Structure formats: C-alpha cells, structure tokens
Design a protein around this motif. Structure first.
Motif, PDB file in Angstrom:
ATOM      1  N   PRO A  72      26.954  40.535  32.664  1.00 19.70           N
ATOM      2  CA  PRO A  72      27.480  39.320  33.292  1.00 19.70           C
ATOM      3  C   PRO A  72      26.389  38.272  33.451  1.00 19.70           C
ATOM      4  O   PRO A  72      25.208  38.521  33.210  1.00 19.70           O
TER       5      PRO A  72
ATOM      6  N   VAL B 245      27.130  33.996  39.459  1.00 20.77           N
ATOM      7  CA  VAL B 245      27.778  34.828  40.454  1.00 20.77           C
ATOM      8  C   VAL B 245      27.882  34.078  41.780  1.00 20.77           C
ATOM      9  O   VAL B 245      27.658  34.655  42.849  1.00 20.77           O
TER      10      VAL B 245
ATOM     11  N   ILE C  32      28.200  32.747  45.173  1.00 21.81           N
ATOM     12  CA  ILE C  32      28.737  33.435  46.343  1.00 21.81           C
ATOM     13  C   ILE C  32      29.182  32.474  47.435  1.00 21.81           C
ATOM     14  O   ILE C  32      28.364  31.771  48.043  1.00 21.81           O
TER      15      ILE C  32
ATOM     16  N   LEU D  67      32.398  37.035  39.283  1.00 19.50           N
ATOM     17  CA  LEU D  67      31.578  37.440  38.137  1.00 19.50           C
ATOM     18  C   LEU D  67      32.193  37.015  36.804  1.00 19.50           C
ATOM     19  O   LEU D  67      33.255  37.520  36.435  1.00 19.50           O
TER      20      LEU D  67
ATOM     21  N   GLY E  13      39.133  44.393  29.719  1.00 22.49           N
ATOM     22  CA  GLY E  13      39.525  45.455  30.609  1.00 22.49           C
ATOM     23  C   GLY E  13      38.468  45.886  31.594  1.00 22.49           C
ATOM     24  O   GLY E  13      38.759  46.717  32.465  1.00 22.49           O
ATOM     25  N   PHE E  14      37.242  45.384  31.477  1.00 23.18           N
ATOM     26  CA  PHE E  14      36.215  45.851  32.386  1.00 23.18           C
ATOM     27  C   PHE E  14      36.387  45.288  33.778  1.00 23.18           C
ATOM     28  O   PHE E  14      35.858  45.864  34.733  1.00 23.18           O
TER      29      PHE E  14
ATOM     30  N   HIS F 294      39.111  45.359  35.551  1.00 23.53           N
ATOM     31  CA  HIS F 294      39.836  46.350  36.328  1.00 23.53           C
ATOM     32  C   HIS F 294      38.992  47.593  36.513  1.00 23.53           C
ATOM     33  O   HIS F 294      38.898  48.131  37.620  1.00 23.53           O
ATOM     34  N   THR F 295      38.380  48.067  35.429  1.00 21.00           N
ATOM     35  CA  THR F 295      37.588  49.285  35.512  1.00 21.00           C
ATOM     36  C   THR F 295      36.525  49.178  36.590  1.00 21.00           C
ATOM     37  O   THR F 295      36.238  50.155  37.286  1.00 21.00           O
ATOM     38  N   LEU F 296      35.950  47.992  36.769  1.00 22.32           N
ATOM     39  CA  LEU F 296      34.983  47.818  37.838  1.00 22.32           C
ATOM     40  C   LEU F 296      35.714  47.517  39.140  1.00 22.32           C
ATOM     41  O   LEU F 296      35.559  48.236  40.132  1.00 22.32           O
TER      42      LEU F 296
ATOM     43  N   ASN G 147      38.590  47.982  40.326  1.00 25.99           N
ATOM     44  CA  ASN G 147      39.282  49.135  40.903  1.00 25.99           C
ATOM     45  C   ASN G 147      38.329  50.236  41.348  1.00 25.99           C
ATOM     46  O   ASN G 147      38.458  50.759  42.462  1.00 25.99           O
ATOM     47  N   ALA G 148      37.350  50.596  40.511  1.00 28.52           N
ATOM     48  CA  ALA G 148      36.418  51.633  40.942  1.00 28.52           C
ATOM     49  C   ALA G 148      35.661  51.229  42.194  1.00 28.52           C
ATOM     50  O   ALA G 148      35.303  52.090  43.000  1.00 28.52           O
ATOM     51  N   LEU G 149      35.426  49.935  42.398  1.00 35.30           N
ATOM     52  CA  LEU G 149      34.743  49.546  43.625  1.00 35.30           C
ATOM     53  C   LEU G 149      35.722  49.455  44.782  1.00 35.30           C
ATOM     54  O   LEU G 149      35.393  49.847  45.905  1.00 35.30           O
TER      55      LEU G 149
ATOM     56  N   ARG H 157      38.202  51.314  45.187  1.00 36.14           N
ATOM     57  CA  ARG H 157      38.422  52.699  45.564  1.00 36.14           C
ATOM     58  C   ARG H 157      37.394  53.145  46.599  1.00 36.14           C
ATOM     59  O   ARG H 157      37.748  53.565  47.705  1.00 36.14           O
ATOM     60  N   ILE H 158      36.104  53.034  46.266  1.00 34.90           N
ATOM     61  CA  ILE H 158      35.076  53.557  47.162  1.00 34.90           C
ATOM     62  C   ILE H 158      34.906  52.676  48.389  1.00 34.90           C
ATOM     63  O   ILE H 158      34.492  53.160  49.449  1.00 34.90           O
TER      64      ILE H 158
ATOM     65  N   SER I 120      35.453  55.911  50.930  1.00 33.86           N
ATOM     66  CA  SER I 120      34.212  56.578  51.300  1.00 33.86           C
ATOM     67  C   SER I 120      33.124  55.556  51.592  1.00 33.86           C
ATOM     68  O   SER I 120      32.591  54.927  50.677  1.00 33.86           O
TER      69      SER I 120
END
Lengths: 50, 50, 50, 227
Positions: A6, A9, A11, A23, A29-30, A32-34, A36-38, A40-41, A45
């Motif tokens: 990238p 950015v 802010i 970003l 497709g990246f 969503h892959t990022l 969503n994975a972020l 999620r956590i 968690s």
C-alpha cells in the motif's frame, strides 16, 4: 511474481475516541481478506480490563 | 478520377503500413485492433486551395 | 461506377462483461452486474464455489 | 497468545491433499482458514502456456489438414497442460510427432527443468499415416488470470502471425476447503485444529504453497503494523 504494497494512509481523527483510517493500494480481494481478518481479532481476542 | 487501392497513403508511418502487404491489403491472419488499416484506399481531390 | 471491391472478414472473440443479457428457459432475464472473484463466491462445506 | 505450527501433511492423490495445522486458539481456526482460503484460491505461482507458434497455421480459426481438432480447440487444450519449471521464468518447448494416433503430453522434448505431471494429457489426435505437426510452445510463469486480450497493448511488433497467443491460466489451486475441528491436546482448556482440504493440478507441493500464501499475508501486514 512481485507483490503490490500500500501507500497513502491519511488518518482522520473523529474526536479522541474513534477515527476512520484509509488504505489506497490493495490488490484484488485483499481488502476483505485484511479488513475481515482484522475485524475478527479486534472484536474478539484483545487484551482488556473490564 | 478513379480511386486506387494502392498501398501508398499520405501521412502514415511505417508502423501503420507494416500490417499491409505491397498491394495495400492486410495479410490474412494478422491480428488487428481499433484503428488499424485493413485496406489502403485513396481518392483524387484536386487543387486543395489552402 | 465501382471499379473494385475489397471485403475483409474479421473474427472477434468476445467473452462476457457487465451489460450482457442472460436468461434461463423459464423467462427470467438478467444483466450481468459485477464479475466477482472466486474468493468472494459462496462455497459449500466441501469448498466448491458457485 | 499461543502460536500455531504445522503437522502431518497427508498426500492422497497427485491432485489434492489435506494439510493440517494443530495449535489454534479459540476461533483462530476460522480467522486463518478463511484468510488462507482467500490467498490460496487467488494469488499463487503458476506457469501456463502463453504464446504458441505452430507449423502452417496463420490464425487460430483454421484447420490443419490431417488432424481432427480445430486449431482453436487445440489452443484451449494447451491452456490445460500442467507443467513446472525450476530456474527459468520462460522456456520454449518444442513438440513434434506424426503418424496415426493420439498426440499426448509425453511426446514433447524433455528439458532439465521440464516435469510433465500428466503425460497422458491429450493435446490432439493425428488422423493420417504421414501427417506431422511442429509447434514452439512458449511457457512462462506468473500470477493470476491474464486473458489474451489484455496482452496486446505492449505488442511492440509481435509480427510472427504464426505465434498465436492463448489465455494465461496461472494458478495451481482448483478447490480449497477448510474445516475446523476441535483438537484436544493432552493438557489445555480447549484448542482447535485446521483441516485444509485443497485440490491442485500437481504443479505445486502443499508445504511450498501454504508458506508463500502466509508469506504474502504477513508481507501485507507490514505497513499495517504502523502508519
């Protein structure tokens, strides 16, 4: 087989609690892959004191 | 006057006339895109009066 | 009046893109909206996308 | 924040396999499995045939006397030929054969780095006693789907009218599935497993794949960890 990274950015703070970061250069497709994975956590968690 | 199918076309580069044979017709099988010259054609217009 | 005629035959291969009309045998029309990656396609437990 | 590691990698067929990742905490099986499915199905190294120059053929729309496959149909068959290279980013393979019978994928000229994973793969048939087909098959390596259409912009005099281009299929992966089963290690509260059932043309080994997948993953996170 090189892979795009990238850039930019800017802010934008919304007060002091929350904000909308951005970003620009994500390949196919990246986003969503990022995103969503972020997501999620972040919601699940994380260290916290409640 | 009569119109010629000759391959001699005013104001065209070598890259344009490349895909044409000596006669001015595109070779069979040559892959083309928008703007390529399929058939060279020129018609008489005299005394332009510029 | 015509001295000679040159007929050229072009074979274009078009695949599919947003805007094409599509329908089943049952009278349901449609216009392809987005072409989505295989990554974002709904998949079953076995992993085969749709 | 206990971290995972790989475990038994079970090859089943030359096509597909089930890899497994043992130490995943609560819900982390999903967080990866989907994030891993994404990069697996999409961005992976592959080598697919691109430019093919054949014997007497001017264009993909003709028919070579002595072979029952239309040239267009033979090009499509090539897009499905699975190969692998080692030290070359493009190699040009010379295929020659004649005589009545099938022309398979084992009839090509072997090279130091050439490995044909499906020697039985049918390129086309041959219908006459004396009929011979020569072709220069230019195979390169890359990522994603590059259709033959977007290739004609650089061009810069690809004049070889006999060089017919095909669509870039680059990818090993066919079908990827992930299943998270609860893994019970002898002492721990609750941990999960990751069963990734993938499907492949045999041109990439399972352990190699999952690394470069996760490799790109952390490589994109690089910027993320700051601003």
């Amino acid at each position: 087989t090189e892979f795009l990274k990238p850039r930019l950015v800017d802010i934008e703070q919304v007060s002091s609690t929350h904000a909308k970061v951005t970003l620009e250069p994500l390949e196919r497709g990246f986003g969503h892959t990022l995103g969503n994975a972020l997501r999620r956590i972040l919601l699940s968690s994380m260290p916290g004191c409640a | 006057g009569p119109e010629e199918i000759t391959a001699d076309i005013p104001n065209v580069g070598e890259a344009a006339l490349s895909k044409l044979d000596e006669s001015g017709i595109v070779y069979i099988g040559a892959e083309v895109t928008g703007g390529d010259i399929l058939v060279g054609k020129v018609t008489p217009k005299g005394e332009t009066q510029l | 009046g015509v001295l000679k005629i040159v007929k050229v035959y072009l074979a274009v291969k078009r695949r599919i893109q947003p805007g094409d009309k599509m329908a089943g045998r049952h009278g349901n029309k449609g216009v392809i909206s987005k072409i989505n990656p295989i990554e974002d396609m709904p998949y079953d437990e076995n992993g085969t996308p749709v | 924040f206990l971290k995972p590691r790989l475990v038994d990698i079970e090859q089943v067929s030359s096509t597909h396999a089930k890899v497994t990742l043992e130490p995943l905490e609560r819900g982390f099986g999903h967080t990866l499995g989907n994030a891993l499915r994404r990069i697996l199905l999409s961005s992976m190294p592959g080598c697919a045939v691109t430019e093919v120059e054949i014997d007497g053929v001017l264009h993909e729309y003709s028919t070579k006397e002595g072979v029952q496959e239309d040239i267009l149909e033979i090009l499509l068959n090539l897009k499905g030929l699975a190969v692998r290279v080692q030290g070359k980013d493009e190699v040009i393979l010379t295929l020659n054969k004649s005589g009545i019978g099938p022309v398979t994928a084992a009839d090509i000229t072997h090279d130091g780095d050439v490995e044909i994973v499906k020697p039985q793969h049918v390129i086309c048939h041959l219908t006459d006693e004396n009929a011979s087909i020569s072709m220069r098959i230019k195979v390169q390596r890359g990522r994603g789907y590059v259709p033959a259409s977007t290739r004609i912009h650089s061009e810069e005099d690809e004049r070889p009218i006999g060089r017919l281009l095909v669509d870039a299929c680059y990818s090993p992966v066919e079908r990827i599935a992930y299943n998270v089963e609860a893994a019970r290690v002898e002492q721990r509260t609750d941990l999960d497993k990751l069963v990734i059932e993938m499907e492949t043309n045999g041109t990439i080994d399972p352990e190699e794949a999952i690394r470069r997948a996760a490799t790109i993953l952390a490589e994109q996170l690089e910027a993320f960890v700051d601003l």
